[PDB]
Amino acid sequence: WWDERKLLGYKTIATLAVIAVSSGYYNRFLSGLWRSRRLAFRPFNYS
Amino acid sequence: NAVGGLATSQIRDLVGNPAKSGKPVVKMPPYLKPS
Ligand SMILES: CCCCCCCCCCCCCCCCCC(=O)OC[C@H](COP(=O)([O-])OCC(O)COP(=O)([O-])OC[C@@H](COC(=O)CCCCCCCCCCCCCCCCC)OC(=O)CCCCCCCCCCCCCCCCC)OC(=O)CCCCCCCCCCCCCCCCC
């Protein structure tokens, strides 16, 4: 199964690479909601 | 100055401007002074 194995390896790695690229983009896009959050605190009335 | 016999402005200054009571002042512990 030498040649079948090599060819299947190439094709599987290629498809997983496509999935990885797309899902990485989508993950970084979704994280933009939290990576850009801003906080503010209403100050107390100190002396 | 008198509007119909009334020194309204004077009355205003004595009646129309009550003092406003704000939030109580919180004494700051000395270890919280740094900004
Ligand atoms: C090739 C195909 C197959 C492989 C594909 C691999 C994926 C390719 C990328 C995806 C494709 C789409 C395009 C890019 C999209 C953006 C990136 C993305 O997909 O992010 C998804 C996702 C988004 O995450 P996030 O929500 O932003 O939060 C993650 C960080 O905390 C966020 O923290 P941060 O944002 O503050 O910054 C930290 C940094 C952390 O991420 C990294 O470091 C990843 C990149 C590392 C390589 C960097 C190369 C360049 C370095 C230059 C030198 C810099 C200086 C370094 C030294 C300084 C010394 C003083 O974050 C990023 O880099 C995020 C991406 C920033 C760029 C945005 C896209 C720009 C446009 C793309 C092109 C740019 C111009 C170039 C032109 C085109 C070239 C093709 O990223 C991750 O999850 C991180 C991936 C890396 C993890 C590594 C650590 C793993 C830890 C252990 C787990 C595994 C255990 C088992 C391992 C061993 C098993 C044996």
Side-chain angles (χ1 to χ4, degrees):
Chain A
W1 41 71
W2 195 267
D3 298 3
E4 281 77 9
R5 196 169 59 185
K6 277 198 175 187
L7 200 49
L8 273 176
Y10 295 136
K11 285 137 79 173
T12 63
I13 293 172
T15 62
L16 284 172
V18 178
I19 298 173
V21 165
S22 187
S23 47
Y25 167 82
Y26 189 30
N27 182 11
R28 187 47 145 74
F29 167 85
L30 290 184
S31 292
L33 170 57
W34 314 115
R35 293 178 299 96
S36 57
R37 75 212 298 266
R38 290 125 83 187
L39 274 167
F41 300 115
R42 299 194 174 281
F44 283 128
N45 180 256
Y46 284 114
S47 55
Chain B
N1 288 259
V3 184
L6 283 170
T8 58
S9 63
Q10 177 190 0
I11 303 173
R12 192 168 297 105
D13 302 329
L14 304 177
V15 185
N17 190 28
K20 187 63 177 180
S21 185
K23 304 175 290 184
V25 170
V26 179
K27 54 179 177 178
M28 181 155 50
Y31 82 92
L32 286 173
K33 289 190 72 176
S35 56

